[PDB]
Amino acid sequence: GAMEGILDFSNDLDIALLDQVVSTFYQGSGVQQKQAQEILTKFQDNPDAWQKADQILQFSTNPQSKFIALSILDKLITRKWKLLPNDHRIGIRNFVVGMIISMCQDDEVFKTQKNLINKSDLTLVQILKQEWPQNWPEFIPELIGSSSSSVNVCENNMIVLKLLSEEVFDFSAEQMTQAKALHLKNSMSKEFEQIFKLCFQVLEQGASSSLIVATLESLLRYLHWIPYRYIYETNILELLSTKFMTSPDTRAITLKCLTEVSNLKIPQDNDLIKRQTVLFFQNTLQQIATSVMPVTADLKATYANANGNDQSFLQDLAMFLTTYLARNRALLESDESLRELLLNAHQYLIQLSKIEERELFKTTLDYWHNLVADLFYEPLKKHIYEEICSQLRLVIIENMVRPEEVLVVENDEGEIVREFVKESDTIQLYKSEREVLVYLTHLNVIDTEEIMISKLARQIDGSEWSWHNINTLSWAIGSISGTMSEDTEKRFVVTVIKDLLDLCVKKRGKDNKAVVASDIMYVVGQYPRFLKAHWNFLRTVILKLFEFMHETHEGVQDMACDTFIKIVQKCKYHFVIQQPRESEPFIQTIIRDIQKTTADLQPQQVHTFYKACGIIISEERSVAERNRLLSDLMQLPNMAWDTIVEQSTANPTLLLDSETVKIIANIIKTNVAVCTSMGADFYPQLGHIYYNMLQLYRAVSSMISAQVAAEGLIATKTPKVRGLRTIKKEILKLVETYISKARNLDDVVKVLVEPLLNAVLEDYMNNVPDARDAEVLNCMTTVVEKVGHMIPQGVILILQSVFECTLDMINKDFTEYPEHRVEFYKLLKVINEKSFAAFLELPPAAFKLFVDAICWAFKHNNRDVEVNGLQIALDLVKNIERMGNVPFANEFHKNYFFIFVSETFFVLTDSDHKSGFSKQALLLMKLISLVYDNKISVPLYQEAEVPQGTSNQVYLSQYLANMLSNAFPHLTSEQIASFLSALTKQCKDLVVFKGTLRDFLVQIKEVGGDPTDYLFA
Amino acid sequence: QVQFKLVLVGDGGTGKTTFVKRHLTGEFEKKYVATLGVEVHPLVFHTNRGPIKFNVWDTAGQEKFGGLRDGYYIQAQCAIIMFDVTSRVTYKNVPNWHRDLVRVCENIPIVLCGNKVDIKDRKVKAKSIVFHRKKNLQYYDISAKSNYNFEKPFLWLARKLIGDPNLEFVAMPALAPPEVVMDPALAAQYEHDLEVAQTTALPDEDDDL
Amino acid sequence: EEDEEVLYKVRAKLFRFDKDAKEWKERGTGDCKFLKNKKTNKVRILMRRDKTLKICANHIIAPEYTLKPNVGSDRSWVYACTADIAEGEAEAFTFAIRFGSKENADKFKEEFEKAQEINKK
């Protein structure tokens, strides 16, 4: 089309056409906008487009065209500046400087084209990064001089200086070499005296102005790095904390500056300086109180109204107060004349903490944590803050977020229902709130108890009754478990529970009952110490939870299951012993009525119930009695299993019933649940089902294969086949779970392993890729982890069965079979760690695939795979080194040393694997250090490639210089030589070695990097 | 009408396009196809203060596909900065995106979003996410996949842009749908179309819905 | 929806078949409602997305429609719709709708077919 004309560089650039394409992109829509975007990107990306920038800036009537011209120049300056002839560098500097001057001296342009002038300023700063001060020594003096000729120019100079400071001090770490960063920081430092003089003069001579605001914005950046004498040995603190707090346009930026002043490195034992730190805080707070709002103001209301910049101001005030006080509140704590200031600042924080804004609340809460943690330890301090702390108790008790355990919530229609999903984003908030409230309780347990107990009295008598109010209070009560002595706690908990039960009697309807039930469950579950000391109560609580397991309210039902196991995890001992005045241990009572108790539960809830029983049974350390309890617990699943094993062995067809498949899955899931809590103790139950379970695995495997054969790969998506695979997956999970916890490893090897490998390995190998369970790999990882050292032939069998076929599934792209990918490398990792001899036994062709697989893992951007790839490589190198001077090791180095070096360099330098930098560097350092230390016993070069006596050190340098020369042809020979010299010298000092790598990664992104940068030290 | 330019920025792979698509069509795109430069889509929400239209400029996070880069930000009226809670480098780069953005857009409302909270192995800890505080950005944990908090960034931005802290999304009016019959001639191809649909499995059959 | 009686409501995930790609694409999750207009006695499906409340299905439950199973699910139905106006102008779709359980799916079919009989009257 017509817009594409600007891409033809054989003709003059039609600037009017360019302006039309730009306007179509920014202001148009749909297909035309999309086409214009594509054309502009192609235009921008033309390596000759920079040659058009001057013409565009001169003749365009579209500010966006000019912005894009500047972006083109930015790319040139940042990547190819030193490729340019010197006259082009001078010309570009001249027209950028001239454009800036021209736009500043025209008032209408300076007012209306801020975006373009800011972009021009940044582009100038890119030129300074290349040229200044070595080839632009008078830049700063001339900037300072030019500031007096025009207020527009002066203001713009403050923007330039802000951007320069940012680029040098805030954003240089990733973008410059260590040497270049030091040069520019030193250069700014050396001329800062004159910069500050300009800034201070401007601040002295004005009150409220766009110039003053720009100057203060620059000051904010300088505060990141300048010496504190500029702030404390001038009158600048007075100006910041008085004059500039009074006008709202300067107040925002001044407050941010004062926050950074509070972070300056300042002498610790100077009374004069301490006085100045107190004074600026005193001044600032006086200005807040007189010009903004008094300490009594309702900041919750102000924030919620959201006028102008009020939300940002209140945020910035919170940041200022918390920052200053966390560092300096001790300066205000001992002098009686400073007590009012200290308490007023904290009172503002109390008011800020009432604001409804979760992220701001986290900020103030972090401060309260800092304060209360200090008051918990520091003698003679807590009394100072007793009124602040008392108010804070109310704030926190009234703003407690719903705990993860409380599974009911009010819907939009006013009904109390089970939550749809977990509120994952309040997990940390709750922990932080609990932390602060626990400290506050410790600081004054009488105040805390009085507040909670009187709030509960107001729920009962109805004056303050609401779901919100009973919930937050109940959550607060639960959250402070552990703060009181057992005896004090005993009285507190009794009072609370009696009152919650009274409250329940009074409140009717399923919504009310669900809310109060949830609160009682939360509280009782949080006080296991109390439960342990009160058996009759505990027994009665558990019986009530069993009643709730029949609730039609699914939230209350599910919470009862969770509360049951939460209590059992802490109180299990009391379920296994025979309590006084009981006829049997309560575990016997539970097991005997388990069918009735769990009848209305969903399967996963039944499994949780069985898991809890397992926790209790493992309390019995007499083996005969424990095994009998396990047998009793498993009676119902074992009886169902026995009947199915009878049927299925008669008929492979009876297993085809979907109802039977579901029954089997749930039997195995029940076994998994109990094995999870019983671990090593589960063995007798595993032995009861083991051989028939593996026969069932084979039978189900046959059904799956038959279905795929008869119906196609689509069969794997059907409910029937997914159900059958669930059986296989749960069997694998059961075995993995047991072996992971097994204490008798002789039995694992002698009884479990051979039949397991027989049942699972050939089946995995001989199924089509889409029917292979990644869970097989996961199970084998645990087998090798726990008993790999005892089963060398078994480990070889595992590799033969899963290695080549799994590699072929995952080596065509980085995305297919994501679970197999991840489990495959976990398996190779543990085999390489525990049974390296298995890799030594591979045929050479398979060992080559192993090296290929490791390097393939490096290239993943998926962290689960990448990290394991890099670890396997490092472990493999270590394994080879441990063999010493033997033929396998010598051949390994001859075949693979340079493969590992080159592949590691590739992922280090391609900008697509930045997450792996640290482990890549570790690997490269290990490889280089092998040659530096002469640990490779044979030549790495074939003979006649280099003279016969040549060291591996000399050859490694030659190889690497050639590799880098060809891969990075824009580097000079000396850049490459200097880099390699430094890198090789630094191969015993990881932090320095990594710095050298980072410097190389900077230099490869540009032309003409200084080779002396690699001498940085 | 009442329409606002929104720019979406953040590292490649963080879920920017997937997040927008979810809002546009309801779908969850499982594949990672890198955005080339920028994709612009209009996106309308119905509120108690009337409709609000965002013109969403979904920018490329991969350096090699960045296109006009900060040129996309010109005249943006709001923004979302995205990272991935399962990738620490993406949070480490948030200050870089923010720097480039605010240099062009000096006073706009910006939401920072930590995406992919559905993934079990979270790497950027909740406690670590503090960059937004001094920069006055709103922050939310989100998941385009589970829809966790998916509406929050747009609700907050709408409130800031309209200047009404009590603005809420409301149910769009639902016109009476038409009475129509399938034309007989098409019925033969509809049989084929339905067979293909019936025999293509629905995704994520282990999900709650 | 002021002039309409809610005959049935169930939580559901709705998909549309993309025939150009060869895949199902989610259109929305939320409450699927069968609404009977009190003036005309016509019954429609109206479904809105959680949180945003955007309409993801709005069509008459036509007597001609037939619910069919999907190969991968025992808790879903697929059917051709010839006139859905969720996105604006009436458009034809192949929909799939999935529920929390088989029991809900079977109840949906029962209610769907009752609604079809009402629309025949």
Ligand SMILES: *[C@H](CC(=O)O)[C@H](C)[C@@H](O)/C=C/C(=C\[C@H](C)C/C=C/C(C)=C/[C@@H](C)C(=O)[C@@H](C)[C@H](O)[C@@H](C)C/C(C)=C/C(=O)O)CC
């Ligand atoms: C609604 C009840 C209603 O409708 O009236 C609520 C939601 C209830 O359904 C839920 C109750 C739950 C637990 C209760 C706390 C369990 C009750 C235990 C109980 C009454 C135990 C007896 C044996 C006691 O020990 C009594 C006599 C004693 O006073 C207790 C309450 C305090 C103690 C132990 C004092 C002491 O000195 O030891 C939901 C889990």
Ligand SMILES: Nc1nc2c(ncn2[C@@H]2O[C@H](COP(=O)(O)OP(=O)(O)NP(=O)(O)O)[C@@H](O)[C@H]2O)c(=O)[nH]1
């Ligand atoms: N698990 C999970 N995956 C997600 C989520 N959001 C996006 N993804 C996945 O992340 C991948 C990348 O998503 P995409 O939206 O293309 O990322 P992007 O930020 O637009 N990348 P680019 O900047 O290169 O255009 C896709 O595979 C997508 O399915 C999420 O919330 N959870």
Ligand SMILES: [Cl-]
């Ligand atoms: Cl511009």
Ligand SMILES: [Cl-]
């Ligand atoms: Cl000085």
Ligand SMILES: [Cl-]
């Ligand atoms: Cl115990």
Ligand SMILES: [Cl-]
């Ligand atoms: Cl050279």
Ligand SMILES: [Mg+2]
């Ligand atoms: Mg994208």
